[PDB]
Write a protein that binds this DNA or RNA. Structure first.
Ligand SMILES: [Zn+2]
Ligand SMILES: [Zn+2]
Length: 65
DNA sequence: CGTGCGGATC
DNA sequence: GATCCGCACG
């Protein structure tokens, strides 16, 4: 496309991952993960951060554009 | 067992 | 703003 052949868009990372600059497991089903019992991707893990895709599911979902 | 950082390209 | 990616140390 344009920037899809270099990186990004593989599984969208956590809040702390975007700010820590790190890819991870917590995918588009991180929620369904908690459902099947998730915990914390490799990031939130090493830094006991906050594996979150919630504020996210409501952060990017809100507002227009 | 945590710790952070430069970049693709819009 | 977003996601991807590794790595070298104690
Ligand atoms: Zn993550
Ligand atoms: Zn996480």
């Amino acid at each position: 496309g344009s920037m899809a052949d270099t990186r990004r868009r593989q599984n969208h990372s956590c809040d702390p991952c975007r700010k820590g600059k790190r890819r991870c497991d917590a995918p588009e089903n991180r929620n369904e993960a908690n459902e099947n019992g998730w915990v914390s991707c490799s990031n939130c893990k090493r830094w006991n951060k906050d594996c979150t895709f919630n504020w996210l599911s409501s952060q990017r979902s809100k507002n227009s554009s």
